[PDB]
Design an enzyme around this catalytic site. Structure first.
Site, PDB file in Angstrom:
ATOM      1  N   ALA A  31      82.853  85.189  35.512  1.00  0.00           N
ATOM      2  CA  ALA A  31      81.765  85.756  34.717  1.00  0.00           C
ATOM      3  C   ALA A  31      81.838  87.279  34.695  1.00  0.00           C
ATOM      4  CB  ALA A  31      80.401  85.283  35.262  1.00  0.00           C
TER       5      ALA A  31
ATOM      6  N   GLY B   3      82.016  85.082  42.481  1.00  0.00           N
ATOM      7  CA  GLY B   3      80.852  85.817  42.028  1.00  0.00           C
ATOM      8  C   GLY B   3      79.796  86.015  43.092  1.00  0.00           C
TER       9      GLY B   3
ATOM     10  N   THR C  94      78.764  75.450  35.633  1.00  0.00           N
ATOM     11  CA  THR C  94      79.987  74.750  35.982  1.00  0.00           C
ATOM     12  C   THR C  94      79.903  74.045  37.325  1.00  0.00           C
ATOM     13  OG1 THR C  94      81.087  76.616  37.078  1.00  0.00           O
ATOM     14  CG2 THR C  94      81.248  76.501  34.667  1.00  0.00           C
TER      15      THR C  94
ATOM     16  N   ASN D 290      78.881  86.672  25.728  1.00  0.00           N
ATOM     17  CA  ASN D 290      79.317  87.887  26.381  1.00  0.00           C
ATOM     18  C   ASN D 290      79.245  89.065  25.436  1.00  0.00           C
ATOM     19  OD1 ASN D 290      79.682  86.496  28.715  1.00  0.00           O
ATOM     20  ND2 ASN D 290      81.937  86.366  28.540  1.00  0.00           N
TER      21      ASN D 290
ATOM     22  N   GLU E 179      68.655 107.895  38.983  1.00  0.00           N
ATOM     23  CA  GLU E 179      67.494 107.894  38.103  1.00  0.00           C
ATOM     24  C   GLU E 179      67.063 106.475  37.762  1.00  0.00           C
ATOM     25  OE1 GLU E 179      65.646 110.385  34.291  1.00  0.00           O
ATOM     26  OE2 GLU E 179      67.656 110.844  35.136  1.00  0.00           O
TER      27      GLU E 179
END
Ligand SMILES: Nc1nc2c(ncn2[C@@H]2O[C@H](COP(=O)(O)OP(=O)(O)OP(=O)(O)O)[C@@H](O)[C@H]2O)c(=O)[nH]1
Ligand SMILES: Nc1nc2c(ncn2[C@@H]2O[C@H](COP(=O)(O)OP(=O)(O)O)[C@@H](O)[C@H]2O)c(=O)[nH]1
Ligand SMILES: COc1ccc(N(C)c2nc(Cl)nc3cccnc23)cc1
Ligand SMILES: [Ca+2]
Ligand SMILES: [Cl-]
Ligand SMILES: [Mg+2]
Ligand SMILES: [Mg+2]
Lengths: 424, 346, 54, 437
Positions: D12, D146, D179, D228, D254
């Site tokens: 991903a 991930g 998945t 995406n 910031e």
């Protein structure tokens, strides 16, 4: 990445040969190992199952094992016989007499080291071997006894690889000898400890399918193996074809097996074919693949609950329609899917259909109804074992009744463990 | 075929809705925790709205409006009426009210400023106190706040209605229950049938320590009242009898003297909170059944007192009302294979 | 509702709008954790291999 | 000028990084080989776009990016893709076998063996930086890499770059494209281990992007590519202020300053509008007021939830295209009257606003139509806790049976890490609830 395939015994080698014929056709490879297909989807992952050899040749990564040469010779002489490397034929001469003890303890022990030599040679030629698949029956001697010997030896030498099996369960409707329940029980004990995932291929289910719905009055082993090879191509499509889901044997084990021991899968297929012209609609495909009549393990799925399900659709069709129909099955029957595994049904699509079908669906269920299978075996075991009938074939190879008691207990435990989650 | 799940077994109205739904052969009930439902009859407390509408292939509907509690708990409703421009502190159909917290922003220092002008102006200065058993109606404040602080939860105290409309024969008080169903499109539906929850004891404006002629709860009347049911079975006068009475005795209709105000009040409240709770563009949908409690004064002026978000019906009307919920709230979303509601729109 | 700190330039501008005022472990410990898990893994492997030797 | 290094972990993360860097190149006029003509300062510069690209003596602009995956198949497509020349081989790091959807396999087993290599490549990027401000980390919650490798890498970055800011772009799991059945486990595990190492995390629920693609792009069955490109639009909207001239959200510090007052609640909600199909024949272009108003419809949020029933701690509006402040203030005034917008008592009710006059770049041939103005709202609302609620429920359903736990224990993880992580999540949910009700 790479899979090493092992076929053991008469049944193991006959269904193994059929599997290699079928998927060699699907990937465009011909009996000489020369690629002749048109598309390139056919080659992207061709190395999961094939080695590349001199002259752009494709050689199955497959070891053929038997204690008698009959069926091996039959393979070499058969259609795809010459696509296997001859050095991967490993056989003895004396057979196993449908005797688990001869496969596991005496005759098999004498042969098992050289099989492991070929296994080693095939695996050191691997970039990242993911594991092994074994085709065998549980009712004979070589497949059940020496295949389970092999499995625990492979596990000893490769404890970090996946062990997957296609295991044909005996049935009196399709029976060679009365000792099949003994052999089967001894083997299940092994499998429950030393495989990660086992496809339970019930010769009872195969017989009933050929008889009650393919309208075959006198089913042969060929009619049974046509079903088996359809199912095997089906369940390995996500291993050997590039899709969105880039699956392997370990991910399949991780996602399908919520508890180590409950790793015995009910496979299914649709449409059920015999050795037609009407195209199936996705709703039809979906209703059939979930139908008890399309499942290769003779169990009533309504008698238990689904722990996990994997479903493969092959052909050009509407992904959207597939999603809708799969969701419809789950939402309209949610009773039969355990609620403590969210979203326990996963679907995959492959554009390439199997030979002779514009569309098909393959089903892989981990259901607690599989306990019915083991209960069947257990009853047939006890009926003989309570009179110690036919035990002398086993004590004559050095085995003790205690070992029968142990395997019987472990199988009954497996049954209770399934019953535990049928009611959670 | 549709699926529902039942998470509040102690609800009479939705028990009857479950039965009606099953009796159609097109709804099957699932286990309380099965998330593959079309319909949720939710629990009254901490209903998990955040888990609704994330099930692919399921249109999901629930029988509560997230946020409607601001209308349906007493301090919340006073805060909403005072602070909302649509209703405003100048609201003419809600009594003066104030939010007081126990000893253990508040409003008793703003209360007293008004109470003492009431006592000096020599006006009726009865005030009632309650929260969301433990009620005090008094004439001087130091009884009120003294009682509030013996309990320990937030309380509201509001100008008691000293001149109610009294039913003769009997010279007794009453409250009007209206049932209102807001569907997923935010249609507001008032049920044709209201009920008058009466008292069985003539109205004694003397000592406000006897709650039997000043509070009209179906419960406090069966047990602690003298002649519960002498004038109407179960202390419940329905709308036909009451309209008849208004015509005979007072020369008006229920529709003109009262119902117009009730429809105005209902629509005002619900339209005021519509932007905070509407599910028009949400991933799940809401409907809800409300009970509006009204009190009429001797001038035929209507007043709102409580909005209840989980009301029960009158045994006589369960069947018709629950079947109406099925028809307009549930089958509107999930269809099967002369309406009893008046639609409020202006 | 007042508009403050407006800063602006040839690619764009930015500013603020007020409507109402206001009413870690070390490298040591980490490699220790990683190696502890490796030890549990090696132990489970030795258990398995001993069982297979039996 | 201070540099930013992007880190893409797992499938991903890598495929989303591809999408973003394609977009970036199109926006800054950087060709697939890495040549930017408008760049007169050849071989260097402290321009705004230099925070994401370094330059070679040969005028090649090269992303300050590292791609890391534990199996090779996805990063191999970067290596042979259109932008192969863009990335320098040492930046694309691959293993031999993936994590098998198993957090503990990514964190402990396979992670331990590649972590030092990754940190060495990251250091080679950081050593080309005059004043590195920190990292943008893309990854899924659900994948084994991930989740598991990402958390290990975050821990180690806090060690080796203690004063640097770390930002997350995190794909939250959705059944329609998921998945793995164990994605709730991995999600809770990686969130617990990463919470204290992340200064600000932008969560994208694949469910929301999927539905946006279906409803507004009329894509019947969205793919990872559709999702995406839409996600990369949102990400570009978020990072434009680091890659262009301006005064709002100019450094990574910031982001925390403007969006995260309480450090644990560092998950801003992103809402984006308008999303218009390229196949829309006749489109009537939407005004400032219409796109700003659409920033308050849950259907446009990166995570479906209901901000009406929460409270805001901060709110930023990032516009691109033909927008001037007064039309913004005019739209805000009316929206405030017609919408439920409650800030926490200890915060000012207000909006930090950023405008960049260049309207969104769209990928030629993509699904998104060009539009004259667009906005992305970043608001820190307690409503996003709904998503944690969902995840923590799914987790609880499996863990009560210990379903699948043996796969994690078998990698060397202890069962206690599960309940530890789940307890941290219970703390988070309570923080949200007390800040917001
Ligand atoms: N939005 C989006 N989500 C993706 C994409 N690829 C995978 N996912 C989501 O990520 C989760 C799966 O994790 P992956 O990133 O694919 O797995 P991984 O990180 O590579 O880890 P492994 O287990 O080792 O393969 C699921 O929820 C997917 O739907 C993508 O390209 N875009
Ligand atoms: N489905 C199927 N079952 C078989 C086949 N051959 C044998 N069997 C079954 O396998 C069991 C006998 O084992 P077998 O493979 O012949 O003995 P082995 O050579 O010692 O391993 C019995 O249950 C047979 O019905 C076959 O080709 N297909
Ligand atoms: C129910 O949850 C899952 C999630 C994933 C998987 N995987 C890894 C699969 N792996 C293989 Cl080899 N084939 C498949 C065919 C269809 C669907 N999935 C798979 C299985 C079950
Ligand atoms: Ca330059
Ligand atoms: Cl530092
Ligand atoms: Mg035989
Ligand atoms: Mg991966």
């Amino acid at each position: 990445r790479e899979i090493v395939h092992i076929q053991a015994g008469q049944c193991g080698n006959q269904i193994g040969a059929k599997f290699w014929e079928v998927i060699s056709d699907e990937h465009g490879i011909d009996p000489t190992g020369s690629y002749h297909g048109d598309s390139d989807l056919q080659l992207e992952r061709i190395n999961v199952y094939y080695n590349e050899a001199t002259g752009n040749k494709y050689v199955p990564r497959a070891i053929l094992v038997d204690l008698e040469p009959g069926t091996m010779d039959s393979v070499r002489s058969g259609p795809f016989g010459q696509i296997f490397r001859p050095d991967n034929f490993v056989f003895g001469q004396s057979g196993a007499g449908n005797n688990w003890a001869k496969g596991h303890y005496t005759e098999g022990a004498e042969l098992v080291d050289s099989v492991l030599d070929v296994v080693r040679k095939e695996s050191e030629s691997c970039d990242c071997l993911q594991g092994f698949q074994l085709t065998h029956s549980l009712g004979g001697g070589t497949g059940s006894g020496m295949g389970t010997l092999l499995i625990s030896k492979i596990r000893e030498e490769y404890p970090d690889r996946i062990m997957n099996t296609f295991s044909v369960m005996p049935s009196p409707k399709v029976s060679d000898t009365v000792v099949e329940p003994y052999n089967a029980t001894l083997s299940v004990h092994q499998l429950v400890e030393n495989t990660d995932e086992t496809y339970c291929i019930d010769n009872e289910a195969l017989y009933d399918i050929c008889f009650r719905t393919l309208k075959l009055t006198t089913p042969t082993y060929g009619d049974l193996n046509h079903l088996v090879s359809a199912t095997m191509s089906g369940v390995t499509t996500c291993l050997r074809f590039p899709g969105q889901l880039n699956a392997d044997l370990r991910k399949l084990a991780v996602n399908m097996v919520p508890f180590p021991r409950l790793h015995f899968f009910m496979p299914g297929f649709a449409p059920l074919t015999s050795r037609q012209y009407r195209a199936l609609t996705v709703p039809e495909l979906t209703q059939q693949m979930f139908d008890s009549k399309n499942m290769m393990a003779a169990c009533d799925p309504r008698h238990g609950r689904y722990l996990t399900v994997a479903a493969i659709f092959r052909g050009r069709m509407s992904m959207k329609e597939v999603d809708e129909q799969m969701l419809n099955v789950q939402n309209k029957n949610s009773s039969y899917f355990v609620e403590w595994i969210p979203n326990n049904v996963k679907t995959a699509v492959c554009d390439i259909p199997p030979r002779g079908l514009k569309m098909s669906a393959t089903f892989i269920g981990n259901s607690t109804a599989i306990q019915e299978l083991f209960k069947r075996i257990s009853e047939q075991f006890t009926a003989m074992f309570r009179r110690k009938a036919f035990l002398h074939w086993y004590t004559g190879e050095g085995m003790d009744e205690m070992e029968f008691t142990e395997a019987e207990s472990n199988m009954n435990d497996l049954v209770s463990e399934y019953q535990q989650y049928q009611d959670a | 075929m549709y699926t529902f799940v039942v998470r509040d077994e102690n609800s009479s109205v939705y028990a009857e809705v479950s039965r009606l739904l099953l009796a159609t052969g097109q709804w099957k009930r699932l286990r309380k925790d099965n998330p593959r439902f079309n319909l949720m009859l939710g629990e009254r407390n901490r209903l998990p709205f955040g888990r609704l509408g994330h099930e692919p292939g399921l249109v999901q509907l629930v029988n509560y409006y997230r946020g409607a509690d601001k209308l349906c708990r007493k301090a919340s409703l006073v805060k909403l009426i005072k602070t909302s421009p649509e209703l405003s502190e100048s609201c003419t159909w809600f009594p003066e009210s104030y939010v007081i917290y126990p000893t253990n922003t508040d409003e008793r220092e703003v209360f007293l400023a008004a109470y003492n002008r009431r006592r000096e102006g020599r006006e009726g200065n009865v005030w009632i106190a309650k929260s969301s058993e433990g009620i005090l109606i008094s004439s001087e404040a130091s009884e009120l706040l003294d009682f509030i602080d013996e309990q320990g939860q937030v309380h509201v105290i509001q100008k008691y209605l000293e001149k109610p409309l009294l039913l003769e024969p009997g010279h007794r008080k009453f409250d009007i229950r209206s049932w209102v169903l807001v569907d997923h499109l935010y249609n507001i539906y008032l049920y044709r049938e209201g009920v008058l929850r009466t008292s069985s004891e003539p109205y004694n404006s003397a000592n406000f320590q006897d709650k039997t002629c000043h509070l009209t709860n179906h419960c406090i009347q069966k047990e602690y009242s003298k002649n519960y049911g002498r004038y109407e079975e179960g202390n419940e006068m329905f709308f036909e009898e009451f309209n008849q009475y208004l015509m005979d005795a007072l020369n008006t209709t229920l529709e003109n003297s009262i119902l117009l105000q009730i429809k105005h009040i209902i629509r005002s409240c619900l339209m005021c909170i519509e932007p905070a709770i509407s599910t028009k563009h949400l991933h799940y949908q809401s409907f809800q059944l409300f009970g509006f409690d009204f009190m009429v004064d001797e001038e035929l002026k209507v007043w709102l007192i409580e909005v209840n978000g989980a009301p029960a019906c009158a045994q006589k009307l369960y069947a018709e009302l629950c079947q109406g919920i099925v028809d307009v709230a549930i089958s509107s979303v999930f269809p099967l294979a002369t309406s009893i509601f008046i639609k409020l729109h202006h | 509702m007042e508009v403050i700190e407006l800063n602006k330039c040839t690619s764009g501008q930015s500013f603020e709008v007020i409507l109402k005022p206001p009413s870690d472990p070390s490298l040591e410990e980490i490699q220790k954790k990683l190696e502890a898990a490796e030890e549990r893994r090696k132990y489970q492997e030795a258990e398995l291999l001993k069982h297979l030797a039996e | 000028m201070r540099e930013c290094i992007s880190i893409h972990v797992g499938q991903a993360g890598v495929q989303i990084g591809n999408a973003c860097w394609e977009l970036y190149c199109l926006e800054h006029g950087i060709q697939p080989d890495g040549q930017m003509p408008s760049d007169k300062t050849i071989g260097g510069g402290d321009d705004s776009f230099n925070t994401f690209f370094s330059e070679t003596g040969a005028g090649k602009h090269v992303p300050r990016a590292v791609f890391v995956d534990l199996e090779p198949t996805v990063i191999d497509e970067v290596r042979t893709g259109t932008y192969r020349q863009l990335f320098h081989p040492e930046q694309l790091i691959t293993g031999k076998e993936d994590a098998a959807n198993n957090y503990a396999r990514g964190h402990y087993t396979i992670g331990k063996e590649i972590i030092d290599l990754v940190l060495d490549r990251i250091r080679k990027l950081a050593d080309q930086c005059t004043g590195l401000q920190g990292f943008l980390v893309f990854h899924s919650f659900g994948g084994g890499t991930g989740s598991g490798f990402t958390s290990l890498l975050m821990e180690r970055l806090s060690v080796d770059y203690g004063k640097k800011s770390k930002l997350e772009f995190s794909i939250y799991p959705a059944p329609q494209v998921s998945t793995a059945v164990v994605e709730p486990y991995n999600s809770i595990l990686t969130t617990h281990t990463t919470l204290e190492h992340s200064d600000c995390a932008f969560m994208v629920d694949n469910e929301a992007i999927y539905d946006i693609c279906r409803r507004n792009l009329d894509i019947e069955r969205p793919t990872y590519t559709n999702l995406n490109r839409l996600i990369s639009q949102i990400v570009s909207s978020i990072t434009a202020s680091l890659r262009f001239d301006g005064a709002l959200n100019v450094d990574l510090t910031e982001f925390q300053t403007n969006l995260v007052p309480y450090p644990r609640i560092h998950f801003p909600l992103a809402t984006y509008a308008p999303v218009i199909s390229a196949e829309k024949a006749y489109h009537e272009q939407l005004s400032v007021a219409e796109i700003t108003n659409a920033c308050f419809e849950p259907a446009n949020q990166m995570v479906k939830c209901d901000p009406r029933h929460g409270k805001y701690m901060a709110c930023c509006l990032l516009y691109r295209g033909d927008v001037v402040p007064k039309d913004v203030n005019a739209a805000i005034a009316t929206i405030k009257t017609k919408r439920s917008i409650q800030f926490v008592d200890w915060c000012p009710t207000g909006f930090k606003v950023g405008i960049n006059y260049q309207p969104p770049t769209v990928v030629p041939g993509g699904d998104l139509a060009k539009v004259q103005r667009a906005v992305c709202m970043l608001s820190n609302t307690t409503a996003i806790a709904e998503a944690w609620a969902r995840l923590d429920h799914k987790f609880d359903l499996m863990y009560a049976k210990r379903a699948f736990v043996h796969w994690y224990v078998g990698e060397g993880m202890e069962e206690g890490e599960f309940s530890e992580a789940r307890e941290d999540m219970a703390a988070l949910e309570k923080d949200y609830e007390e800040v917001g009700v």
